[PDB]
Amino acid sequence: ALAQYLVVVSKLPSHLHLPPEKEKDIVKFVVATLEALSWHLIHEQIPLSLDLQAGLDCCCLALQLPGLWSVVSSTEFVTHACSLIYCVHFILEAVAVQPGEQLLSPQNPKYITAACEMVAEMVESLQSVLALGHKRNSGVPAFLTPLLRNIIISLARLPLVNSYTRVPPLVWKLGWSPKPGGDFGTAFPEIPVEFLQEKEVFKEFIYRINTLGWTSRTQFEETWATLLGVLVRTQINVLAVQAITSLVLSAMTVPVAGNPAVSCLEQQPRNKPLKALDTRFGRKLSIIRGIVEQEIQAMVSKRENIATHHLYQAWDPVPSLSGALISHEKLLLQINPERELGSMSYKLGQVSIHSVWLGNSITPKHRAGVDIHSCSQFLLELYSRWILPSSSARRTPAILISEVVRSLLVVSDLFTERNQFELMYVTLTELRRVHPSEDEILAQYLVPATCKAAAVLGMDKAVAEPVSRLLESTLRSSHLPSRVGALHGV
Amino acid sequence: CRIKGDIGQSTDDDSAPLVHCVRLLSASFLLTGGKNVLVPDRDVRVSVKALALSCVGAAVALHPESFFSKLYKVPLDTTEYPEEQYVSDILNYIDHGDPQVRGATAILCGTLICSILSRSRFHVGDWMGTIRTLTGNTFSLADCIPLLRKTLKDESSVTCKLACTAVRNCVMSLCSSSYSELGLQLIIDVLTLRNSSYWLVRTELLETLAEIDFRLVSFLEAKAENLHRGAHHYTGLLKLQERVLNNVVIHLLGDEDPRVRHVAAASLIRLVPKLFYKCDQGQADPVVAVARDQSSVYLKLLMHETRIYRGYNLLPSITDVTMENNLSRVIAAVSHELITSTTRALTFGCCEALCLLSTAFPVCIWSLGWHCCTVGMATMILTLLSSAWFPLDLSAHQDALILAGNLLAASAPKSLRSEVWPALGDRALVPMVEQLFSHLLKVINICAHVLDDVAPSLGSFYHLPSYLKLHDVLKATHANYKVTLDLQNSTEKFGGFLRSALDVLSQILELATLQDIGKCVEEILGYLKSCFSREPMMATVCVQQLLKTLFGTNLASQFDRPGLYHYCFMAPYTHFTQALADASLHIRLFEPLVIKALKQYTTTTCVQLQKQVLDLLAQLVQLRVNYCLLDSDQVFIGFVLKQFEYIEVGQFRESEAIIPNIFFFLVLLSYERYHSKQIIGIPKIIQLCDGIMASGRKAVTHAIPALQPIVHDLFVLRGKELETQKEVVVSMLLRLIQYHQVLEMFILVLQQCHKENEDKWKRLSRQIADIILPMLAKQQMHIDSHEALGVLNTLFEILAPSSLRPVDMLLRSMFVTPNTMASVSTVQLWISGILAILRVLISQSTEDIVLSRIQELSFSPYLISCTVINRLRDGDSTQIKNLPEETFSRFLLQLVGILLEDIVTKQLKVEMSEQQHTFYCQELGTLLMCLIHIFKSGMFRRITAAATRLFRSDGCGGSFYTLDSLNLRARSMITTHPALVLLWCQILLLVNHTDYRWWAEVQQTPKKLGMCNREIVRRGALILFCDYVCQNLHDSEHLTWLIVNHIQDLISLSHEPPVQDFISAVHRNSAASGLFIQAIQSRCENLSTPTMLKKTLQCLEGIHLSQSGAVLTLYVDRLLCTPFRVLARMVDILACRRVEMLLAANLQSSMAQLPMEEL
């Protein structure tokens, strides 16, 4: 009952929202239910699947509500937060790992350090054990893999264990062991950039931040500065460029910017709302086509942004820019046709140039209090100097140039000012005139980015012909993704 | 490093020397006089401490009692050392500093566990009970288990490797004991060792798991409830066999270390017989699977009874259904890794595993296992040969060549007829055979270029880049070989590859004909000329196959519910009874390549090549090739004769491998005539044979193999001079008549003599019988093995019954006494002689005849009494109207006592071998089988009456084995030989010995998973007891006792035939049915499992009509309401039937069954 209530409380009227005076009791109840499932598992046997789902559904949804998350995150509820970590880890092991097997096959009270180790263990398990369809997931029923993934990411963002979890395990075995200090005694400092100079530990750090996102503006700036320090052997540079691109892109997730467990990337479809609706007869179609659509979603749409089992919860990440998300019933046939039903991962046509010209007031920011213009401006200046060797820049590596240009194309979705688009087009246009054209791994990103830049610029006469010469040229290419990206640029 | 007291002396009498030896080197290097005081390593280095600990473990292996002794025999000063110390304190070195000492302590615990269990006969409850009374030690056998567990999780890889070795010694003993749950725990713990960076730990784990009998493990898993939960409350099942097979054995086939891959493949082969899968036709539950293995050896009833290549099997094979299923499941798993192989290591490992599997379990024999005759998976293996990277690995390439040839050869019977490759007649396989044949000619052509070091039409490869790369790999390996001198290195990659290529080509040449080869036959002979010097054996084997194909002599050119009762008792008894019943009843091209084989024969010292040249020469003569054209000056035949001088004086390095081929070649050459001149005569061959036996060379390897090609020639296919040679050979066979191999030779001679001259068959049978029978009395026959006794058993049947009809000689030889019984070999020879004669008496004669002749030859029942037995066991060689049946029955009962006493009181390694232990149990099994047949067939009534009376009677003043003495020796064999105990249980019924002292104990009647062997007896005894009641329905006590005490086992075992009849008998009797219902009500809680509840209803279905009112009460009270709806439906159907047959009967009878209050 509670899970059914919480899964819809995000789109309820104001008077039906969660009462603040009952937020503490709900958190206590959620922990108690998970404790009961573990206690029943310990004593008698595994609980009913409808009981495991009900207990974990409440935990998954409660950690998604900002009202309830701020309660479990408080120091007063540290025991409850530790109990959730214990019960979730216990249930996951009691269902996925056999006896004699490991989950990861290669001052303060003791439970605090144990809870930190549990979450860091489970976070790494999302790679193999809790990756749906992975060979290691064969031991986990498919109705618990998406439920446990969301819970772990929500638990790993708790202030108690977030600082510890972001530290790669490869650093712990090394000499790094600073004295933790904070409200919980586990606010470990951010790892020094000296460790990140090694590839295999930088990969672990990138996975940790990408999986957990960021909990606040302060954390975003910290990891922004950390990645900047690394970005000044080439393997470290491409890894840093990718990590910065993901971090900057992570600000576009609509409901809550940082949270990966509640949010998905912004979608601005290129198709305007249909005129045939909202008529005398089209309105009747919407009522009846909505029922058909409400069942196609529950049957064929990969519920990427939905964690719990509830069927009628589909919603698209399309904010009402002019804001709150547009209800799915009002986006009948607006979503991009080339996007899979329910798929919310990044795509090459993520945001339409309409939404670039609207809200930004452009003729042909700072989401959740995180200044992205200062960021997006910085890389644009940084990347432009990097891929333009005006002086003797010792022939910048091709892998760097390709990965940088891909970064430009991805972060171009967050470019706010017209001058930003003009600079990137000029930067790319100069890159074409100097880079040899036999490269295809580069042209797959360069072609759409240049087309996207000229698209916002207004497709003017001077900018028209070079793009027109480019698009046909890359159309007859042996590399398929070069053709695919070319069409997206088209 | 100082002995601070008295430890005893080596020359001491009150205790074994090993007790002092353990004390000596424990106080000298490992312990002080104080409790829990490790000797500091300053005085003795850890090298000595590690070396001394291994000495204790090896000593404790032969004598576990030494480990529990006090450190000092005389207790030293009680003031300086307040508490005495035990030798068992050396286990504190499990926490030492260096890894080597820690590992040695782990191995000591593993050895200690295995020895204690193997010495107590799994009765550790009593063995540890007396050892703690004799020495006062409070050590528990369940204390080394934590030591082994924590030593497996060791930081050092050296210690972890030694900890794995310790588990390997004691894992199977623990599983087969009352500590099975600890043995199961160890298997779980060692599973994590696959993720080890040290390859030695990985290989050690593979060998450890290869020792596991998973039929036993599956039994332990089936009844392990809390062990499935593990330490973290797991909600599934352990699935140990699935994890061990897939996550370890198959998984490690993909290891990057070839040594680990090779061990995994070998461990895969060993595991295949021991796997267990549910829903198998051969075995239903693990208990039956375990009982099959044990009964297949002890109860192995003993009897006796143009060359296709290695991988062909035409005649139908009586293949086991069970392990064909195991083979198919394993082969499927290996192949699934071969398709989904992303690494070169997994492809190399899996291809090697299948090549080895096709050798251990030939695909031509187990075609139903190799994915149905079959070709198995030949497109896959031939795909790899057509790849661009797989052929370049010489080790894996030759694994695929052999495997591909085996699979194609496995379809030969069902894929022949009587274009290209006309004989195949299954044109689907023609591309596969054509591809492999062309591929083999290419690689052999490559090797031909490599030996001939000439730079690079069917075998042409100069235009294929993939073969040019292979030629470079083979060129490199030979170049390395060309500058080394390692002649004793078998694992030479180039030499192994050329051998494998010539091996498979020789195999495929069977399926070919002259039509599809006569074009390319000259190019292959060119390849062999260059490849002959490197690999002369297989180059000659390939020549033979070419001749067999060129002359049309190859295969292508010449073509036209079982449960415990069945396995334990019924199937072996039926075979034994039936056996008793039947007892009473272009060539010019080869010449350059054949002179080289002759020329190399006279210069090489390789007997494998030498015995192959003779094989080629024998085949050439059989094809009527003029021998004078080969031996232009009698040089080779002269050289062969000159080899005998070195052979008979022991100056031939290995003559046993060449004698069978030399004589077979010579006897075949006696027919050929050098233009009216014989090359050699049979008289000379006979004289050559007699010189071999006359010398000191063992007749088993030099004289007997020499005779076989001679007797199989004269006496199977061949009269003025022939007859006298036959008698001379017969005379020579008589000298070696003590060897069971010669008995086979005489069996052949008698059988052929049975068709030429029946009168001579009578004389020869009388001559043989009058010769062997005295030697059976004096134990001069080499019949101390299962194979040897089986040959002798069939020889008696082949003998003319007139030669044995006067049973005076048989009884004189059977009723004898050996020189001594202190030697196991003498005891076995004595009993083996008795069993051979005993079979004749109960098969080729009647009870009346045997008992009658016992009176005239006054054999005494005291021939082997307890007094004579004890006196003989020390090596000392020096009445009334007793009916003959008493003497005959006493003789057999004493033999049972002898075998029981020294099977359960004879050391497995100190006093007797391992083969001697099996033959001891085999001898007991065939003796108990003989007793069962005598007491069950009814053809021996007086003997059965005498035995029934003698079993009931006590021992005559302790001079004979009383029944209680026999039961004690049999009751202690439950844990080790349950198959033999069940035979003893059968005999106890046949003599109507049904006291509940023995029966309520073997059945574990109610007045820690347990042992599987205890369950085999417990279920087996219950089955036999029910069968006995089925023949004794008048007895109303053994029927009510079974129901009220074993109804749960009756229901569980209801699928067994004897139990089925017992339940049917219970249904027919009204009183029995009433007890059947009442017992179920009192034990309904255990009848809650859906499997057990269904069996309860099946039994409860056809119950007696007069009990309808009672069973209907049980249905609607304790069985109707179940969570399982299918069983509730079944109860409803049966309950409806009871009501519909109650109102359809007499009213007053139905009124009695259901009173009004009950209704």
Place this chain on the structure above:
Amino acid sequence: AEAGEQFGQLGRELRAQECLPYAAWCQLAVARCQQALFHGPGEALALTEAARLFLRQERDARQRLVCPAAYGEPLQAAASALGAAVRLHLELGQPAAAAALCLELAAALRDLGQPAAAAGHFQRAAQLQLPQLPLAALQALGEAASCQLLARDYTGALAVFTRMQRLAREHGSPAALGAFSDVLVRCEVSRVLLLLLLQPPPAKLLPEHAQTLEKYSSSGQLPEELFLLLQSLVMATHEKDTEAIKSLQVEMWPLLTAEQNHLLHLVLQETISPSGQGV
């Protein structure tokens, strides 16, 4: 010839420094050189290596470090190279090698979160293997059925399971040969669970499904406890006794795989809370 070896060592060096997109590009170049040399096996190997490098790129961008900026870009190149390799293999025969490449692509897609395309490629591999390796085709179809169950294509999974049962019966025989017996057991249990979930009407009820449902209203190759529990489950779902399915679901949990446990959970869920009502 020499250009191919040059591109090969270029790719080896590039993989040494782990700039594997360019290593895959060099593998494509050496595959083109093999095309110029008309060497089918070498070209297939080069395309396989390029596809494996691209797949490792996508795995790193999606599994090792989960980059939200990744839009499956090297996956397209991997699929193109694998399709070219499969086409080459088929044009030179060797359908087993093409089926192996298709299995590799399907496994990669399944790990990357695209069960539908993975199931399609698994079915293609099974079709390529079926005329020659029926057991390998059955395993590939089993992977396809697992992927379709991942994609919530329950009717497609039922069709694949029925096809596998038919193929196992007609190829592995009457009693199965062990290697086909486990396949038949999985087919039977999965089909029974899927038929209790979907509940086809008489129009959609094929003769095979009707026969299988008749069998559960004796045990061919299923363990007696599992067969009895499945019969109880079928009777309970035909009777609508939710307590019975709850008790069975608790009871049959250790005896079923995680896939079959998920299917039984779906059956129970659609029993208490039917889907399609809109509430």
